[PDB]
């Protein structure tokens, strides 16, 4: 009568029974025209004699652990205008009597283990408003051609699913329909032209299946279009211009195909339009100077294309802008001022150009700027001071260009640059010792300048993990402060004028994998110090130095150690110190003056013979018979 | 739940 969840007919018969969020288990009066029994966590077969209640015109089992098919008797019940059976692990066929509910509006089958073929019988249901069927990972086969002939639909969803071949030119006949979502399933073949027909069309996504062909023309006469994702497909041909069009688009994303042909100038005229991603295509041309007047773009990935020419100044037009992606592809040209114009950049990524000139200094003044990635180009002059002002700057590659003069000290006012690389450059002088006021640096990469000058415990911010000075003209002394850097993970500092002895200090970087001192002027003794850093484990590489006397006996605690380069040094004694290491995987001895007998274990077999050939008196023995 | 719609996820250097 009165209880909580059940409602009653005006003549006091019972109507309506609604359990929701209860925490049940387990399994599960005709007047009843309402019945949801919902997030229950009801388990077993849907109970047969559900088909039994002539009056329901709503059943909700949703969110809850049911199994079984669905029987057929469900189909029975003529007056149902909801069927809600989605998240559950339904599994079979739906049956084809589906198509005896006549007045069916809601359907929601989704989330399910269901298989088998969309039914030709839905064709049959002309009042279907919404039918999502998606995240049933073995339906299969394709859309059946009668879908064309459920007029209501408006929201159509078939995603996650093994939905395969053509979209049916049938499709054209839903001139209701909203949204149509079938991505990440079987789908191939070319998008039907007859899609143009569906006047009502707002979200298209076709993202993540095999779909070819190009993308049809007739899509530019869709006026109510919004969002159209098309991404990793096959796609082929040229972009249409006719999309230019669409006046209400705010969202296009064809990344990942195999278009050709030119960025439209018609984009031009899309007012709306936040995201364009043509990631990972064929495209070919300059960036057309029309899509500055997109106003609200506030993201432009055009990356991985074949596109030529300059970035256009007219960039500064695009006031929302947060994201540029135009990295690898053929732009030349200076990168233009007016891009610090838009304010509210957080990345940019110009990288694997053909880029020339100085870098602006204006860029430096974006004051959200997180990531600035301009590596691989033919960029040249300095670095500007002005890259102070950058105050977010938090991953910095200016890798693999030309860029000349000393790193500027005021890169030390940037207190959340996380990871610098400028390797590959014309750098030359010291490096600065206010770069000790990053306080975030973790990756630092100088590698393949001219830097020179010596270098300081001091001028290193103690958050490193990761250096690579290595291939510059550093000298002097390997500084005891070294020390301080307890993070420090990798430290190369190969081919570079460094000398004197390895400081002891050394030992008290407990986080050290990777130690590559090679191609230095290192001298003296091996410090047994060296042997106590049990974290040493990817590679030790000491070789092309003057060191003199023996490996340290300490080095037999260096347990993790896979891969040790002493060759190329002064080296006396033998290698029993040595012969215990049982993840040693590479050894480079040669070149020394080692001497004595090496066991015939399969591990020193496997050293080459012209490595011995290098040394004092170094050779294979066999062990006596006792 | 299967996934949201999504776009395509943007790669940087
Ligand atoms: C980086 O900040 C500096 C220092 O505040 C800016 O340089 C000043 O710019 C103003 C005009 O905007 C001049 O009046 C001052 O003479 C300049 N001072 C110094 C010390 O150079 C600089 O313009 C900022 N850079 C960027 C790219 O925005
Ligand atoms: C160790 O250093 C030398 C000189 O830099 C280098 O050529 C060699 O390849 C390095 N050895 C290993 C194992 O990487
Ligand atoms: C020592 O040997 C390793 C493995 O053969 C090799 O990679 C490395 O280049 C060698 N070192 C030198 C100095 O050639």
Known sequence: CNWTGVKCNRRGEVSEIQLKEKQLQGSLLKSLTSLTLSSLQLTGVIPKEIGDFTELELLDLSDNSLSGDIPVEIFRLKKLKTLSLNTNNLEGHIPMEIGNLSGLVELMLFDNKLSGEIPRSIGELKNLQ?????????????????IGNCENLVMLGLAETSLSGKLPAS?????????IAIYTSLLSGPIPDEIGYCTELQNLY?????????????????????????????????????????????????????????????????????????????????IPEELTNCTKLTHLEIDNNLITGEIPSLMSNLRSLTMFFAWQNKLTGNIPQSLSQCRELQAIDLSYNSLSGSIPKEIFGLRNLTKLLLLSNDLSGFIPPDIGNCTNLYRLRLNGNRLAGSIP????????????????????????????????????????????????????????????????????????????????TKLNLA???????????????????????????????????????????????????????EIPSRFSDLKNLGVLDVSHNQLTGNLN???????????????????????????????????????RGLYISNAIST | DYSNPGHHPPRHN
Request: charged fraction near 15%; hydrophobic fraction near 35%; proline fraction near 6%.
């Open chain 1, 206 to 286: 076709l993202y993540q299946n095999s779909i070819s062909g190009s993308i049809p023309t007739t899509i530019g006469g869709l006026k109510k279009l919004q969002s159209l994702l098309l991404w990793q497909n096959n796609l082929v041909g040229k972009i249409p211009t006719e999309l230019g069009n669409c006046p209400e688009l705010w969202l296009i994303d064809f990344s990942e195909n195999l278009l050709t042909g030119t960025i439209p100038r018609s984009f031009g005229k899309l007012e709306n339009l936040q995201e364009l991603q043509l990631s990972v295509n064929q495209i070919s041309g300059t």
């Open chain 1, 130 to 146: 919404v039918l999502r069927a998606g995240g049933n990972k073995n339906l299969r086969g394709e859309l059946p051609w009668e």
């Open chain 1, 409 to 488: 000290s005021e890169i030390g006012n940037l207190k959340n640059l996380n990871f610098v690389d400028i390797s590959e450059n014309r750098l030359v002088g010291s490096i600065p010792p206010a770069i000790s006021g990053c306080e975030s640096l973790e990756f630092l990469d100088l590698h393949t300048n001219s830097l020179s000058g010596s270098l300081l415990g001091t001028t290193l911010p103690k958050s490193l993990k990761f250096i690579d000075f290595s291939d510059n003209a550093l000298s002097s002394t390997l500084p005891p402060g070294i020390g301080l850097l307890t993070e420090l």
């Open chain 1, 495 to 549: 081919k570079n004028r460094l000398s004197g002895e390895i400081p002891r200090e050394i030992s008290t970087c407990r986080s050290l994998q990777l130690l590559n001192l090679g191609e230095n002027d290192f001298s003296g003794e091996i410090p047994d110090e060296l042997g106590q850093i049990p974290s040493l484990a990817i590679s030790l590489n000491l070789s092309c130095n003057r060191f003199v006397g």
């Open chain 1, 171 to 179: 499709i054209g006949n839903l001139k209701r329909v909203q949204t």
């Open chain 1, 577 to 615: 110190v040595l012969t215990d290491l049982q993840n040693l995987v590479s050894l480079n001895i040669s070149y020394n003056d080692f001497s004595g007998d090496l066991p015939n274990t399969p591990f020193f077999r496997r050293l080459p013979l012209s490595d011995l050939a290098s040394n």
